[PDB]
Each structure stands twice: as structure tokens, then as C-alpha cells.
């Protein structure tokens, strides 16, 4: 996993990408296609482009570069933002409070119980399934941070 400082380094450099996303995207795809030609064969749209000149001249390759780095920038930002809320909670619950994963399972079950009790008409079996899975992913995320911090949960 990344520290807070490491995430800030990632977001700082992504700021530079966004100032010329089209140029960054083009250079990334040309570097990829030239180093690993089998990757170009996956693009039915582009595999006819032989020369670096033809790749640089392609409107669509340049537009696709922008699509790729736009999507990746959004994933990295949303990852960083989830980390910024998960990390402090995992830190206190591992090091200060020392809360076992089983206790996190108990409060997860309590939350599902209370939502079923307060919203019986709305919180049906499907919605309950959704919340059960989301709280399991939450517990797994905490457990992975516990491990990194060397707390046996």
C-alpha cells in the first residue's frame, strides 16, 4: 500500500498530465505499441498504422490516448480519496482501540439488523444483500491495513 505522502506525489504528477492530456496519451500509446507490438494487434481500429509518422498523424489514436489517461486519472483520484478516509480508521482501530475483525463483523450485523428494523418496507432481501457485501468489502479493506500495520485482527 501507499503512505499519505506517496499518494500526494501521485496526485501532484497527475496535475502535470492534465495540462496536455492529448500529448501524454499519444506518447504513452506509441511507447506501448513500439515496445510491445502485440498490444497494437488488440486495436482493430489502429493495427494498420505501421510508421511512427502514421501513429502521430492518427486523429483517433490521439483521442484514444486522452480517453485512457482521463479514465486512469479518475481511478487514481477516487482510489486516493477512499484511502484518505480508510487509513485513519484502520490506524486507530489497529493501534489504539485494538478491535478484532470479529467485532467489526458484529457491528456489521448490528447495522443490517437496525436497517431491517427501521426500514422493513424498503430494505428488502436485495438491498440487504447489497449492504452485507459492502460491509464485508469494508471489513476486508480494514483487515488488509491491519496486516500492513502488523496488527493481527
Amino acid at each position: 500500500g501507499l503512505s499519505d505522502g506517496e499518494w500526494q506525489q501521485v496526485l501532484n504528477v497527475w496535475g502535470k498530465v492534465e495540462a496536455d492530456i492529448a500529448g501524454h496519451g499519444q506518447e504513452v500509446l506509441i511507447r506501448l505499441f513500439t515496445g510491445h507490438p502485440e498490444t497494437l494487434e488488440k486495436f482493430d481500429k489502429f493495427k494498420h498504422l505501421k510508421t511512427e509518422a502514421e501513429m502521430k498523424a492518427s486523429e483517433d489514436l490521439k483521442k484514444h490516448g486522452t480517453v485512457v489517461l482521463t479514465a486512469l486519472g479518475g481511478i487514481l483520484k477516487k482510489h486516493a480519496a477512499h484511502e484518505a478516509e480508510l487509513k485513519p480508521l484502520a490506524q486507530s482501530h489497529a493501534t489504539k482501540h485494538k478491535i478484532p475483525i470479529k467485532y467489526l463483523e458484529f457491528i456489521s450485523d448490528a447495522i443490517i439488523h437496525v436497517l431491517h428494523s427501521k426500514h422493513p418496507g424498503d430494505f428488502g432481501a436485495d438491498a440487504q444483500g447489497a449492504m452485507t457485501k459492502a460491509l464485508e468489502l469494508f471489513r476486508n479493506d480494514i483487515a488488509a491495513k491491519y496486516k500492513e500495520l502488523g496488527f493481527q485482527g
Copy 2:
């Protein structure tokens, strides 16, 4: 994993939690402490509160319930946001484009090289280490979605 509709169900029910967060937080901790009395022993401020009545009268237990459901709500929303961008990418790249994880490693190499080439002043050894780890976590997240979809590589 959760489907798109399942994530929306999680967000919808959290809106109902936030409409009476005091009541929800109280009832969650009461359900936890009454169902699993060993969990009360973790709370120096609360562990003397044995009955549901004593717990319901505690202004501090009610405030702590709100702190818990506020923290959890923020983490679920940030998780949903990351999933909303990761899921469609894993879906197309598994089912339509059929992109092996190794090819994601190749484009990750190209990204790091282009960032180092264009922005050496903002892409030192540490920052490069940070981006290498972030892109590996991205690949791992896609690989986990590939597995759910039963696509190997």
C-alpha cells in the same frame, strides 16, 4: 463484488440513515452491546451501561453512534465512487477487448517512462516508486474484477 444497482441501493439506504443519524447510531450500538456484551468492554466511557435503558439515556453513547455511522458512510460513498470507475473498465477489458493483465503492466511501464521523460523535475525516485505502486494496485483491482467475471488473461 456489488453490481451497479447494488451500489446505488447502499447509497440510497445511507440517505435514510443520515435523515435520523442520532436514532440509527443509538440503535446500532445498543444492538451491538446487548447482542455481544464483550464489545462494551472496549469502551471505557460506556462499559458500566448494562441495560438498553442506561444505554438509551447516555448522550455520549448517542454522539459516538453518530461518529461511527458518519465515518462508515464516508468510506462507503468513497468506495462506491472508486467502484463506479473501476467496474466499467474491468467489464469492457475482460469481455470485449480481452486485455491480459501483463498488457496493463506494459502500459504502466510506458506511463512511468513518459512521466519521467516529460516531468523529471516532479518525478523523482520516491514519486516514481509511489506511481509504480499505485499502478500495481490498479492492476490488482482489475485482476480481482477479471476473476469475478471468470476471465483469466
